[PDB]
Amino acid sequence: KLHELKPAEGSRKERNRVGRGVATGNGKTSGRGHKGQKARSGGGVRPG
Amino acid sequence: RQTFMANESNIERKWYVIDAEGQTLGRLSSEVASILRGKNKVTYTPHVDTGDYVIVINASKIEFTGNKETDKVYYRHSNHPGGIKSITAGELRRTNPERLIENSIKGMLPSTRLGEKQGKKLFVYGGAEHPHAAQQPENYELR
Amino acid sequence: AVPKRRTSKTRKNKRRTHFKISVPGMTECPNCGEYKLSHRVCKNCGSYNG
Amino acid sequence: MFAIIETGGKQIKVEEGQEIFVEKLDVNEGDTFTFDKVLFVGGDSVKVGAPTVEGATVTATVNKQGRGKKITVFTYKRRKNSKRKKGHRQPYTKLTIDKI
Amino acid sequence: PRVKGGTVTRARRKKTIKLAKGYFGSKHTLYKVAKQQVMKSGQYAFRDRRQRKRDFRKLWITRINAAARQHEMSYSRLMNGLKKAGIDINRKMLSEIAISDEKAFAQLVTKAKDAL
Amino acid sequence: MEAKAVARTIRIAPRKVRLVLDLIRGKNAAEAIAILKLTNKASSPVIEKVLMSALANAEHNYDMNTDELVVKEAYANEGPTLKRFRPRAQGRASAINKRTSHITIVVSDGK
RNA sequence: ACCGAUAGUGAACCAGUACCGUGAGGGAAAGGUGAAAAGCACCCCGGAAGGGGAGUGAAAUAGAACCUGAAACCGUGUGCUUACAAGUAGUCAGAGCCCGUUAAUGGGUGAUGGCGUGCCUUUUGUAGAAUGAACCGGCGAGUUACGAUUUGAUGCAAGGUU
RNA sequence: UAACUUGGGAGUCAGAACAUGGGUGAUAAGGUCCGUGUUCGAAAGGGAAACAGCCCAGACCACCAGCUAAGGUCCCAAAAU
RNA sequence: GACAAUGGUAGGAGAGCGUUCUAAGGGCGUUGAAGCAUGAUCGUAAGGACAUGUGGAGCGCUUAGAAGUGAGAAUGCCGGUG
């Protein structure tokens, strides 16, 4: 029924949001680390 | 929680007199300090005064050991630039024997607000006669 | 020089303990019936005795 | 008179008609309880010693089975983004002594 | 859709300011200063719950020492004598007996001396 | 029973008025009038009209006698601020606050 | 399954306007009484502004500076405490003095005793005399499109899919 | 009571003190460069007066219970004048 | 019921709270909604109720869906006030 809906078991998962407080585990640096070329906006080196 | 706490509604204080003739200065001062605080009672409470009053007569003929008569020196500073004073313990005995005993005992008490009040119950006299006969002081022997 | 710290409201009010004004110093005129300053003339009928 | 009883980890000093607070027991509210371990009895009657007094039980009745006030546990470390928060309510058992 | 603030930021900030009543000056008024002091209060209380047990054991032992000296013996020899007999009464109960029942304590000092 | 009068939006700084209000707080009505007439401050005549208006309210609106009256309450509250500027040196301007106050006086017969 | 007056066009309002520049050019802030103006006749203090009554209205602490009306900050009155004392201002213990709850081993204040050098960032290492914040409020930072790969679910199966 | 293999996701490439085996310096440095252990980093609690790196010892929570380690027992300050 | 584990920065993994809008079902409201204020209340945390004042017209609950979805700090921007 439209008021009792249920997706299949294990078929959905919630996305992870970074930069939303220290308790989440991805708060300040958002998983990037400390002060490098790979910690800047725009990324780093070419894939090869 | 069963622990008893003493307070001013039920504190009892009494008076003692102690003879300072033929005793070492430091061995007598350590015992007097344990009495002014109240460490000899079963109702000792840390945050209230429980100890008793002490009268010290015959403040002269207090005895040192070794060469302390000339070697032990007391220093003070007047908080003015270049002013520091000095006096020998053998010289203070013959000119202010009451201060010699009084300062030694006061150095063995905590320097809190309660410590100053607990140190105001000591009376020291250089002779064998005291004027506190309105109370009923009792003779005390040193452990 | 400039202040190193902000002054709190407790310290500010302590400093203003003595900042106030006094009473004028007035007496009653026994011709006017109303108040006047000592050693000054009355302002109601403009009389000064003595 | 009075007795010393061992109610698990700790000891209590009890008289008759006195209400006491202990840690949670398996009894229900209203039923009777017995303290089988008594270490000392005094008063006018002859003083008895230790390690255990031969018999000498104490009886009491259960009044309430509740929990204590909530205390918040909080710790943190400065300059390290680490902290924790926890609540706690400790359960107790209320009793009233009636026969030593 | 656009989600704005309101009724969420104010609610949680009032909870912190309400735990700091009685504090001096701006430490019960301004949120940022009050937030710091409330964290230090929780850190202090955790430490002080465990120091409260060391503070009260010392007080009982001091009182047992004074009572025992009135019977011509020290604290250290009193606990050895009781242990050699098996009294198993802790320091909290011995202190409560010396204050209240003066001649019941003397019933325990004798047995501590009987076993030496 | 009490009577009151209010003067709103008076162009005087609030903390200059409060100095005068400290002298007449708690005095008889006849004594407060004399104090205000003999004090040589700027805000004394302004407060004089507020107390006179409140005294006349106790005689027409109500039925109270002006011989047993006292000054029960006398306080000043802040009003809107007028924002101005002052040209300083080197091409800079400094702000100036022209402040305003609300003045209230209550006179009570007692009871 | 777009915004709801710091948003949405710079501009919901006499806005490319006030204003700024020789000029090209740059550019704001400002919405809300009430269902109905029925927008306070009349009396009192004053030169006036402002107010106290009396009336209108369901309501005037809805009176045009008008729906609701938070915080910083400024004042008035009161229960407990403070003028011999060395304070990151709290925490644990604790007399005395006042109150009475979402009724429960209750609330307010605090004579004294023990312990105790803010937060963030950056560092081998910070109470640091290394950086940043005067206070309060609003706003302010891993998203979407198209491809690749891997994991879970579902349908069919030597076939699957447009 | 771990180890090896195949896949998805990382951070790290400025380290410091103590003891010990050596080079360099001057058998100087809280110096500098290597080998071998510990602790800090990323570790609260007790001792060394105070004192990241020294000695003891690894905090899930509550209790006004007991036994110990380092270090201590005349007074401050708990326990042998 | 018996035993065992539970300090932690960079970083990996898991389970949840709350906010605005949509769908379906079921409800509350002038005999007084949201918002605001106070309170000695409940849960392990994010947080949720109730009572009383003010307020004068909208708003919750259950299961799903989608995001302009959470602020203490950038010599941050705008307004008010020391």
Side-chain angles (χ1 to χ4, degrees):
Chain A
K1 304 197 75 50
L2 278 187
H3 40 271
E4 302 166 61
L5 290 180
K6 205 73 82 183
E9 181 76 80
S11 59
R12 293 281 221 260
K13 198 184 186 85
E14 210 186 61
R15 64 201 270 151
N16 174 250
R17 306 197 297 141
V18 306
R20 288 308 187 271
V22 310
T24 58
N26 294 257
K28 183 177 76 174
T29 49
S30 311
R32 276 187 192 254
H34 273 111
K35 252 159 78 161
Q37 164 174 46
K38 306 165 59 90
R40 318 276 172 189
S41 178
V45 303
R46 314 195 298 258
Chain B
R1 296 193 165 198
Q2 302 258 319
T3 303
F4 160 83
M5 301 285 198
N7 61 79
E8 207 61 27
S9 180
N10 57 85
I11 297 277
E12 299 266 39
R13 311 203 187 148
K14 59 180 293 192
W15 288 67
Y16 292 115
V17 62
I18 298 195
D19 196 50
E21 172 184 17
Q23 319 266 310
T24 303
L25 168 66
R27 309 243 160 198
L28 186 145
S29 303
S30 58
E31 271 146 10
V32 169
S34 282
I35 289 173
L36 292 166
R37 261 192 97 194
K39 299 297 292 295
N40 280 127
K41 307 211 200 151
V42 305
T43 49
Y44 170 78
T45 308
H47 67 99
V48 66
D49 194 5
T50 310
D52 316 297
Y53 301 82
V54 183
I55 313 171
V56 182
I57 57 172
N58 280 293
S60 302
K61 61 203 64 190
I62 193 66
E63 275 307 330
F64 307 126
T65 305
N67 295 328
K68 281 173 200 172
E69 201 201 295
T70 316
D71 292 348
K72 191 171 177 68
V73 182
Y74 294 93
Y75 304 91
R76 52 188 218 282
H77 204 281
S78 84
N79 296 115
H80 277 263
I84 180 165
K85 314 319 167 61
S86 177
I87 192 158
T88 293
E91 189 215 324
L92 194 60
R93 204 212 295 173
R94 63 155 58 77
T95 70
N96 217 348
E98 297 80 28
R99 194 181 280 151
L100 183 75
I101 301 282
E102 175 208 288
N103 269 340
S104 176
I105 281 158
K106 267 165 200 202
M108 287 155 192
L109 304 158
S111 53
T112 44
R113 285 185 219 228
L114 203 75
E116 323 287 317
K117 284 174 213 133
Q118 263 166 355
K120 272 194 225 162
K121 304 192 274 143
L122 180 67
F123 303 82
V124 181
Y125 297 98
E129 182 65 26
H130 64 78
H132 305 284
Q135 299 88 35
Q136 290 290 328
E138 307 180 347
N139 314 271
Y140 195 84
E141 281 326 309
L142 284 193
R143 79 202 186 198
Chain C
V2 303
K4 191 101 185 160
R5 300 278 326 152
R6 178 172 98 186
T7 286
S8 73
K9 38 184 78 175
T10 293
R11 197 176 288 252
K12 165 183 74 185
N13 278 302
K14 273 172 177 203
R15 198 184 58 234
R16 294 181 178 154
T17 287
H18 296 106
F19 185 66
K20 55 195 176 182
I21 78 185
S22 182
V23 290
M26 61 205 208
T27 65
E28 308 85 337
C29 189
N31 173 341
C32 305
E34 75 163 15
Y35 278 92
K36 74 176 202 72
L37 288 161
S38 304
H39 291 91
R40 276 98 184 158
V41 309
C42 196
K43 290 186 286 176
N44 190 359
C45 66
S47 75
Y48 188 58
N49 74 321
Chain D
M1 61 155 157
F2 57 82
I4 315 291
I5 59 178
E6 205 169 40
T7 301
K10 310 184 257 306
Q11 288 167 7
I12 320 165
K13 187 182 194 287
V14 288
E15 310 172 340
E16 306 88 349
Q18 183 193 3
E19 65 183 1
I20 53 158
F21 295 75
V22 298
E23 288 301 325
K24 185 194 54 48
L25 308 153
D26 284 334
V27 291
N28 271 34
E29 292 205 20
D31 272 317
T32 185
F33 189 53
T34 288
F35 296 106
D36 303 279
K37 297 261 183 272
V38 176
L39 278 75
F40 184 89
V41 178
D44 278 334
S45 185
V46 181
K47 325 292 211 213
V48 298
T52 303
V53 186
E54 317 280 316
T57 57
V58 178
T59 46
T61 75
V62 184
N63 296 318
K64 179 198 211 172
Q65 203 94 220
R67 308 205 274 164
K69 194 146 71 205
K70 182 184 284 294
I71 62 164
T72 293
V73 185
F74 182 87
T75 61
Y76 81 106
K77 304 253 187 199
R78 65 170 145 201
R79 299 183 285 258
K80 278 73 178 174
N81 287 291
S82 159
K83 75 193 188 186
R84 192 178 61 148
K85 210 187 188 164
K86 279 216 173 282
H88 192 82
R89 301 189 78 189
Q90 182 80 0
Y92 63 89
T93 288
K94 213 188 157 153
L95 305 151
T96 298
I97 302 299
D98 46 20
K99 264 172 291 283
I100 282 178
Chain E
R2 193 188 175 235
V3 185
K4 64 201 278 188
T7 79
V8 288
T9 302
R10 175 192 283 124
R12 78 160 162 76
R13 283 191 196 153
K14 276 177 61 182
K15 270 170 173 159
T16 305
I17 302 164
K18 211 204 166 290
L19 287 151
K21 64 182 261 175
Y23 288 2
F24 179 88
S26 81
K27 293 200 170 180
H28 69 247
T29 307
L30 313 172
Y31 162 73
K32 276 196 289 192
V33 177
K35 193 208 161 183
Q36 295 171 195
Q37 194 68 53
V38 171
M39 294 183 286
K40 290 203 81 90
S41 297
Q43 188 67 60
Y44 280 142
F46 180 86
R47 177 204 69 199
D48 270 346
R49 270 178 226 122
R50 292 173 191 185
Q51 270 175 346
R52 184 216 286 131
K53 306 170 168 60
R54 330 183 210 162
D55 290 351
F56 261 81
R57 167 145 174 164
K58 273 181 31 152
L59 182 77
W60 303 325
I61 287 165
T62 304
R63 292 176 173 173
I64 299 160
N65 215 349
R69 298 258 174 194
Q70 278 159 29
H71 293 68
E72 295 286 328
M73 65 180 288
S74 60
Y75 168 86
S76 66
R77 305 262 291 151
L78 179 70
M79 315 305 304
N80 186 34
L82 299 176
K83 188 191 249 183
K84 273 186 167 111
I87 304 296
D88 280 344
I89 286 168
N90 59 31
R91 280 91 178 160
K92 191 182 164 188
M93 296 296 109
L94 285 163
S95 292
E96 281 313 275
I97 293 171
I99 285 166
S100 186
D101 213 342
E102 296 176 352
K103 57 191 72 166
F105 189 70
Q107 303 270 283
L108 265 288
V109 188
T110 302
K111 309 180 192 242
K113 278 177 279 186
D114 294 340
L116 319 163
Chain F
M1 178 44 160
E2 307 98 290
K4 79 177 180 321
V6 187
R8 261 185 72 101
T9 316
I10 295 298
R11 170 61 201 97
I12 301 173
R15 64 183 290 234
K16 280 152 166 202
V17 168
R18 285 174 185 138
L19 294 181
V20 181
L21 281 186
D22 284 330
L23 309 173
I24 66 167
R25 191 179 281 120
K27 312 303 177 296
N28 306 322
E31 194 187 10
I33 297 168
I35 292 184
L36 288 169
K37 282 164 83 85
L38 293 179
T39 294
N40 81 347
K41 297 292 262 177
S43 55
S44 286
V46 166
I47 304 157
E48 158 83 3
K49 278 194 203 282
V50 185
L51 176 64
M52 290 309 263
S53 177
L55 286 175
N57 283 349
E59 301 184 279
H60 188 280
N61 301 331
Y62 308 97
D63 273 327
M64 271 185 307
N65 177 226
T66 61
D67 293 335
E68 287 103 359
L69 295 183
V70 311
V71 175
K72 199 190 163 252
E73 308 213 308
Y75 48 94
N77 273 331
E78 266 180 335
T81 302
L82 275 59
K83 306 284 182 58
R84 309 292 177 229
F85 311 86
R86 174 68 55 189
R88 301 301 285 244
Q90 317 272 31
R92 304 191 180 51
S94 291
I96 295 286
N97 298 311
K98 307 269 189 92
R99 297 186 183 269
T100 300
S101 55
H102 305 326
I103 310 178
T104 304
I105 292 171
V106 179
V107 286
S108 179
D109 203 348
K111 313 148 174 56

